[PDB]
Amino acid sequence: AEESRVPSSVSVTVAHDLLLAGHRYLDVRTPEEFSQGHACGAINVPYMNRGASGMSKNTDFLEQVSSHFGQSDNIIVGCQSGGRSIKATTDLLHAGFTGVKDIVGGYSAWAKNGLPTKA
């Protein structure tokens, strides 16, 4: 009974219900999105980011992380774009990108609010 690897696709609409549950939201709009910082109730990062997280930058750690862990292991991830990115995520899934939910959009919708929490 393992469930550390489960790739699923959904829309920010259904994820929103889960977002109310208070679950970590991973979003990757663009490396520059990181330079902007974080968000209020939304964690948007470029897949991998070096930090006190224990150093993890999409480069080789994938072999160590994909070894049995996912950068978003058990998380809700979503690319700024949908459909076109949905199949794109499948390419990353082959490299090891499961155990998380694939949401469509994210920052665009959260941006609609205008409440970005960050340093």
Side-chain angles (χ1 to χ4, degrees):
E2 297 295 342
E3 295 184 353
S4 77
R5 296 184 188 151
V6 193
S8 74
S9 303
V10 1
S11 49
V12 71
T13 100
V14 211
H16 182 70
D17 186 1
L18 277 69
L19 190 74
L20 277 66
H23 290 320
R24 297 187 306 174
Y25 192 78
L26 197 333
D27 192 8
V28 312
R29 183 179 182 335
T30 284
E32 296 183 352
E33 192 184 16
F34 185 82
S35 186
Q36 303 300 315
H38 302 291
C40 203
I43 290 72
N44 314 158
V45 351
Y47 303 112
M48 313 300 263
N49 186 252
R50 179 178 179 327
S53 171
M55 298 184 297
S56 206
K57 189 86 180 313
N58 197 68
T59 317
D60 55 3
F61 294 94
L62 314 206
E63 81 194 358
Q64 281 178 338
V65 164
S66 193
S67 74
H68 269 112
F69 199 86
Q71 82 198 39
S72 240
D73 72 317
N74 197 62
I75 293 188
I76 308 183
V77 185
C79 174
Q80 171 278 317
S81 297
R84 298 185 186 153
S85 197
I86 241 65
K87 63 187 193 190
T89 11
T90 313
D91 295 345
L92 326 189
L93 175 59
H94 302 136
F97 210 97
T98 153
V100 356
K101 296 187 184 73
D102 280 355
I103 321 300
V104 166
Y107 180 85
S108 189
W110 211 238
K112 190 172 55 38
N113 295 343
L115 288 155
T117 298
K118 62 290 201 310

